[PDB]
Each structure stands twice: as structure tokens, then as C-alpha cells.
Design a binder for this molecule. Sequence first.
Ligand code: HEM
Ligand code: HEM
Ligand code: A1A07
Ligand code: A1A07
Lengths: 438, 438
Amino acid sequence: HSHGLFKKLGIPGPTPLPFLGNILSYHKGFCMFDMECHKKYGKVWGFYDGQQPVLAITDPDMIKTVLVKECYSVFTNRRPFGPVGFMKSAISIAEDEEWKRLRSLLSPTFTSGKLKEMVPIIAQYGDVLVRNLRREAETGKPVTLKDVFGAYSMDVITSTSFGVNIDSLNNLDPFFLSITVFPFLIPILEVLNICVFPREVTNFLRKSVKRMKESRDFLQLMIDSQNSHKALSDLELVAQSIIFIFAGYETTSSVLSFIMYELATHPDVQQKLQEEIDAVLPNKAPPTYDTVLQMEYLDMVVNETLRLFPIAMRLERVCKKDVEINGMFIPKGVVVMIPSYALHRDPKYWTEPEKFLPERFSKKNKDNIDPYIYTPFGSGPRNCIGMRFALMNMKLALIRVLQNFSFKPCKETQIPLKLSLGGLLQPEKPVVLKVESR
Amino acid sequence: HSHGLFKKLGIPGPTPLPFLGNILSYHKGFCMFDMECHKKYGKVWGFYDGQQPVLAITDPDMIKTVLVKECYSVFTNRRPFGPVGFMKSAISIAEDEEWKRLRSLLSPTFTSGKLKEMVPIIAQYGDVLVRNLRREAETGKPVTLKDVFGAYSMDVITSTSFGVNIDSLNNLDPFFLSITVFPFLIPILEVLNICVFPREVTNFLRKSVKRMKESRDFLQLMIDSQNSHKALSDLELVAQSIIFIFAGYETTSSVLSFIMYELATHPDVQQKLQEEIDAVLPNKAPPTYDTVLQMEYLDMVVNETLRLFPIAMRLERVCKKDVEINGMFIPKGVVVMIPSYALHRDPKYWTEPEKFLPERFSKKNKDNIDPYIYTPFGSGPRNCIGMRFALMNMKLALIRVLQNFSFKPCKETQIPLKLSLGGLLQPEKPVVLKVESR
Ligand code: HEM
Ligand code: HEM
Ligand SMILES: O=C(CNC(=O)C(F)(F)F)N[C@H](CS[C@H](Cc1ccccc1)C(=O)NCCc1cccnc1)Cc1ccccc1
Ligand SMILES: O=C(CNC(=O)C(F)(F)F)N[C@H](CS[C@H](Cc1ccccc1)C(=O)NCCc1cccnc1)Cc1ccccc1
């Protein structure tokens, strides 16, 4: 029934099926479907997640309007995700004024100053990562990257969020598809006390927090925060910590795997990066905060990897009122979507876009890139609150790992890398590479 | 789970049962439960329709704050009623800016000027009401009032809304209880294309409207309206007409029955009213617009009946943001309720409140009544848009009916009147009275 909307608005798009919309086109993933629609339709098109109208926009002025200019007024919130339980109080899920408050209380936590104070604790677990890598390098047995990296990613998380310090390494799915064909079942589950975050994990940390709270990182800065608006609660403080672990876990690890695959399949870039790391940090010097920002080619590698593998795939905002933006009428309730992956690989902006070419982000060419076409961390008042931390975290990992080791493909290394057909931006097969000691 | 809210806020109220809240206390009706809570708790108290927190307020300053001062900002909408289908576009159901637009387009329809132009068409069907009454008066067979009145109420509706002219007389229930224990099933039904307004009635009028629309009252003024904002649609125009029929049907008839019962059980008031009607309209003169407003004692009878029988029972607003009003913090999502029936019978404001005493509204005493304690039509920007029309409609009915007939109780007349234990403000048994010709 709601499938007449875009037709009335005269916006092109694939014809929807009843009770499914256009969801059957997700068989090749969000990304392939985004690019095919970008090609066949042009600057704007609509489709239907079930009965939910989604409007893709690709014009950077319109993207700036949505993500920045009209954020507070119209496009404040992401599409209603649930069932979430108490995790409704987490910042990336909260809406309107509740989010606007949580953002203010959590923004000073992620300042450049606090991040610098976090570097030495991040610095220690690289040595763990190095020695755990050196144990597998002596063996030579080819390495699955998501393990060794995911262990390191966990080491940073538990340390940077709760002062807990562990050697972790030594110590489009069925449901969410059913969500968009039966989103009238979200409130069904909120009264059923079900949660996509098992009622045990949240229970574990909810009481684990109040142990550390009353026995005495992010938890510190957050506890210091609740010392205008209305300060911070105790259940809310737990929810944010959970959203920080989830955030920094499968993102820090996934990107670092994407980088090692790209460095291995481009040994020249690996050498030029190893040259820059050795020059600024002679004798495998311990990386510091300021030296990390000093390395431009390392930043060029990171951004180029994030261009080919934007973990988020898309950016979304719920249109809370009828609005006109840059000549286009958009009705209330519509989900406006910015196809990040499809823009990061648009030939109309990127020369040879399928190729890993760090020199696009050279200090010369970094000026030609539109910040509303390249958006690995989103943009506007509701961008990645942990952008600077994530970049610092990953760069500190790459530096110490390239001071000691070089990485070579193995016969099992999936060349070229095929992405996961599911709802996650991940490789089909895990990245397996050879680790050689310098 | 949501049952901890008021406890935290320190607001008193009945202790709720799981998965039911306090709904089992509706066995004696909304009204009896409201008065019992007013007595036992005082100025403010909360309770739970299932998991839904409802906050009753009784302080007129707070009532003015909710209904008037903070209407546009915070308390714009009534509690989400559904499943409604396309009737979501009807004004009494619409929310926020959509309602604010529908109100503007429909406000000039209900001006005092247009109402005066509607009187002669309303005047004609009183003669129908009189002659249909005279046929039953010759017989004398005691009369059930909701029939004869409901027929007249229909005659006004179809005439005042579509120019259709008929002699109609000659031509807390199970579901909504399940609504508040399973309100997570409202979106379940919106996708099931079910409706509490059968898919045939709405279908009947939706196509019946476009017949009269393309062949060529309220429909006229509305059609003239769609000739800023965005004008009016065709489906929306039908929805409003349906909400006008529903409005003016069981309300015009229910109140007029409540008035005849009260006039019959108080023959003195009936005589003093018949005296005023004869004096201003000698020789049973045809009532005019201006003469109706000239009659003060008739207005006193109407208001006093509406004090004892406020059809709406309660007034409700959904609190769309966290707010403080007159020293009381109110969290988001709470339903703020104004117990009209319980305030209209509060002895702390009304001397001998159970008694039918029109002299409370005498030009002398009408000054002492607080318009935030007496609210038969609500108050503020979202009051009864059809207040003036309804009063004019009912007064024109009473005048011509009292110029010709007098009304006496019968042995079957339920003295005293017992109200319906359900969710409607209606009598237990229908009102049966004796009709004598003057
Ligand atoms: C490579 C690493 C990361 C990438 C590429 C990334 C990217 C993004 C993107 C695209 C968004 C959505 C922006 C928008 O919708 O406009 C976002 C939001 C967010 N990110 Fe990240 N992120 C990364 C790491 C992190 C880390 C380490 C944290 C640690 C707390 C974090 C916390 C958040 C939060 C809380 C939000 C939601 C903010 C809000 O809703 O106000 N992210 N991120
Ligand atoms: C004895 C007759 C009537 C009584 C006692 C009455 C009373 C009320 C009350 C108490 C409200 C709610 C006010 C609030 O929540 O603040 C209301 C709203 C409303 N009434 Fe009436 N009413 C009567 C007749 C009518 C008639 C004849 C119409 C014809 C159109 C009508 C149309 C409406 C509408 C559309 C609303 C909702 C307005 C909005 O939501 O913006 N009513 N009425
Ligand atoms: O789009 C999708 C897929 N499918 C659907 O949602 C639909 F239901 F439709 F099927 N997932 C997300 C929205 S939930 C995501 C999971 C989460 C985890 C713990 C607690 C609560 C919630 C969350 O909120 N934070 C993650 C932290 C992060 C990760 C990466 C970068 N920065 C921060 C989209 C998203 C991505 C990035 C930022 C914000 C939102
Ligand atoms: O409260 C309750 C009972 N129970 C519950 O709602 C809960 F779901 F919770 F169980 N019903 C109403 C809210 S629906 C009511 C029905 C209706 C009819 C046709 C099309 C759509 C909707 C409507 O909207 N208009 C009526 C027109 C009117 C009648 C009388 C005076 N003026 C106007 C409360 C209400 C009363 C008065 C004005 C506004 C709202």
C-alpha cells in the first residue's frame, strides 16, 4: 500500500513486491544493490524495505543538507532499531533530545586531549600483539588476521574502557530480515523482554560495572562526567560502555585485516609505509601520539582502505517532518539513505575506483575529494563520536606491527578479496597471510 | 517493568499488577475509578494502562499549562489510537504539524458566520422531529429517547455535511481492553488492513464522496477550502466527514437524552424553560440563530447537563518531551490525563454536586466557575472544534421540542439514572419518558 509514494513523487526506483518491497534484491548484498541502483537511476531513487520507503540521495549538497544543515531540525535519528531493551539509552540508538543530551555528556570523553592520555595504555598492548605475532612468526604457520587482531582489539577495549587488563589471546541474516517484513513485531518483543544483546551479556556488564564503580579509561571519564542537562545515570553508563565495546571490537579488527590484505597484495605500499615508520621512529622507536599524526603516508593508507571498505556501508536518517531540500520534496517518516559504499566506488568521482591507490589522499590530491562523497565516519553533529580514537588506535597498531614484521600472501590468501554477501562489511573468507620477522 | 516510574517520581497511586497495570480497576468504569483516586490521593496521582503510565492532574493552573500554555510545544497529541487505517488523516487523530495543518484548513468551516448560515437547514428537521414526536404522542406509548433523537441527530448530520436530506426515522469492551494489554499489536493490525471503522463504511463514504464531488454544508466548505499549507486532499476530505458524522451522531443524541431525563425529573426547570422559550418566541415562533443565544436559562440547562454527563469523561495529552510544569517533573511518553467527570462532581468546587441545579450557571454564579475545572469541550488550541455548532444544534432541537411537547416520567423511567459501566458515557438503560402535547 505504501508502495505508491515514490510513484506519486515521481522518483524512480525498482518496482516493489507486496509484503516484501524490494528486499529480495539484497541477495547480492546492500552494496551491490546500491551500485546497481546508482547506475540504473542516477542521482536520486527510492525503494522499500518491506513497507518502509527508503530514499537514496547522492548529491553532495543534498548530503550536506541532510547530514549537517537540517540534522537537529529534521534528520536527527537513525531508523528505529529494535528490540533493544535498556540499550534504548545508548547514544547511537537514542533519539532527539535524549541523544542530544547523551552526546554532550559523552563528547568531552572523546577530545584530542583525553585521547593523548590514552595512547600509552594503547601502546602497551602492541607489545603483546607483537610477541603474540612473533610466536606465530617463528612457526610461520600462516595467520588468520581477525583472530590476532581481534585479540588486540579486545585488549584495547577492556583497558581503555574499564582499566581491566588481559592477554585475551592467551586467556541480511534470518532475524533482521524478518524485522523488516514484520517491523510491527518490534514492540511485540520489547514487552517479551527479548534482546539482540543477550540478556546475559548485558546482565554481566550491568553488574560488572557497579562492582568497579564501588571498588574505585572511558568508564572513568564517564563517572567523572556524572560528578547542565541531568548528568548521567547508572544503567545509562553501562549501556554506553557496551556500545563502546561493540564499536571498537569488530571495527578496529575488521579494518586492520582489510589493511594487511591490501598491504600484502601491494608490497610496494608496505615498503613505503615501513620506510616512513622507520624514518620517523628510528630503531623501531616507540610510537607516540604526536609521531602518529606526523606520518602522512600511514594516514593515506588508512583512508584508502576505508574508501574500499566503509564498514558502515550506508548512512541513514529518519525524516521527522515534511521538508524540501535542494528542490526535492521529502515526506515525513521516509528513511533518507546515503549509499557510502556506492559513492566510494563511483567512477564519476574516482579514477580507477576498484584499485587500491593511496595516492588519492596525497597532500596534493586530498584537496579534490568531496567530504560528502567520502564519509567513512559519517558527517555532521551525529558522526562517529569515536573517529579520532579509532584512527589513533589502528595507526598505533600498524606502526608497531610494521616495525617488526612484513606480510606476504599465502596460497590460501583469497586474491582478490570477495566481500560477505550478508549484512556485514566483512570478507567472504578470512584473511590468511604470511608473517615474516624483520 | 515500567511500573517503577511513578514510584521513583514519588507520585502516589494504586499499585499496578504485572502485564495489566491498574486496568482491573475499570470494572466500575473510568469515572468511578477516577473519583475514588481523586479522593484517596488528592491533587496528582499516577496509574498504568498496562505498561502505559498515566498521570492524572487536577490543579487548574497545571491544567491550563497542559491544555493551553504548552500545547504546541509538549502536549500536542492525544494517546495513540489505532488501528485506524487511512483515518490516521482525520483531525482528532492526527499529530503535531499534520494536525496543525488540518486544524487551520478546517477552522473557518466552524466559524460563527458559517454556523448562522447552517441554522435554517437545521431548523427544517426540527419540524420532522416534532411531527415524528406527535405521531408517538397521539399514541402516548412511552418513548425511548435515543431513537427519536438519534434519528434527528442523523437528519442534521447528513444535511449539514453532504446536502443529503432524509427522514431517517422513516427510511471497556473486549477489543480496546485487549488494546492496552497488547498495544504492541496496533502495528500488527495496520499491516493487516483491519480497522475499527469497518472497511465497508469507509469504503461506502470514500466513493460516496467522490460521487457528490463530481456531481456538483461541511463538504462544501471543505471543498471550497481546497480551492498556505498544502490545501486539502480527497482521501483526507472523506476522513474528516466521517469524523464529523461520528462526532455529531452519538453526542448530539446522548446529551439531548440526558437533558430530557433531567427535565422530566425536574418539571419546574422544564416549565421555566418552556416559559423562556414561549416569551422570546411567542406563538411557538420559529427559533432563529440570534434568539437561541438570547435564551440564558436554556444555556444554563445545557451546561448543567454537560456538567453531570461530560460525554468525554477524560481529556488526554501525550507528553512529547521531558517537562516541568508548576513544580512537577513529567517524563517523556507519559500520558497526562485531566479527569473531567471527577472534577465536574468534585464537592470541593461544587456545592451539592450530585444535584441537577441549573442555577450554578446563572449570570451571577457563572463567574465563580473555573474554566479549567468545567471543561465539557476541553480547552486550548485543540478543544472541540465543533463546540459552537453542537450547542446551536442541541438548543435548536430543545426549543422546537418544548414549544410543542412536555415530558413526564414513566414507571419504566430509570429513576435515578444509572450510568453505563462500560467505556461510553451513556445510561445503563435507555431513557423512556412520556410525551404530552401542549
Ligand atoms: C574504523 C573505525 C570506525 C569507523 C569507520 C566508524 C564509522 C562510523 C560511522 C559511519 C558512523 C555513523 C555516522 C553517521 O551516521 O553520520 C559512526 C557512528 C558512531 N560511532 Fe563510529 N566508527 C569507527 C569506530 C568507532 C569507535 C572506536 C567508537 C568508540 C566509541 C565509535 C563510536 C561511535 C558512536 C557512539 C557512533 C554514534 C554516534 C551518535 O549516534 O551520536 N566508532 N561511526
Ligand atoms: C455535546 C456535544 C460535544 C461535546 C460535549 C464535545 C466535546 C469535545 C471534547 C471534550 C473534545 C476534546 C477536547 C480536548 O481534548 O481538549 C472534543 C474534540 C473534538 N470535537 Fe467535540 N464535542 C461535541 C460535539 C462535536 C461536534 C458536533 C463536532 C463536529 C465536527 C465535534 C468535533 C470535534 C473534533 C474534530 C474534535 C478534535 C479536535 C482536534 O483534535 O483538533 N464535536 N470535543
Ligand atoms: O545498519 C545496521 C544493520 N541492519 C539493521 O540495523 C536493520 F535493523 F535494519 F536490519 N546496524 C547499525 C545500527 S545498530 C549497532 C549495533 C549495536 C551494538 C551494541 C549495542 C547496540 C547496538 C549500533 O547502534 N552501534 C555500533 C557501534 C559502531 C560501529 C561502527 C562504527 N561506529 C560505531 C548501523 C550503524 C553503523 C554505524 C554507526 C551507527 C549505526
Ligand atoms: O477515549 C476514547 C475511548 N477509548 C480509547 O480510545 C482507548 F483506545 F484507549 F481504549 N475515545 C476517543 C478517541 S477516538 C474517537 C472515535 C472515532 C470515530 C470515527 C473516526 C475516528 C475516531 C475520535 O477520535 N473522535 C470522535 C468525535 C467526537 C466525539 C465527541 C466530541 N467531539 C468529537 C476520545 C476523544 C473524545 C473527544 C474528543 C477527542 C477524543
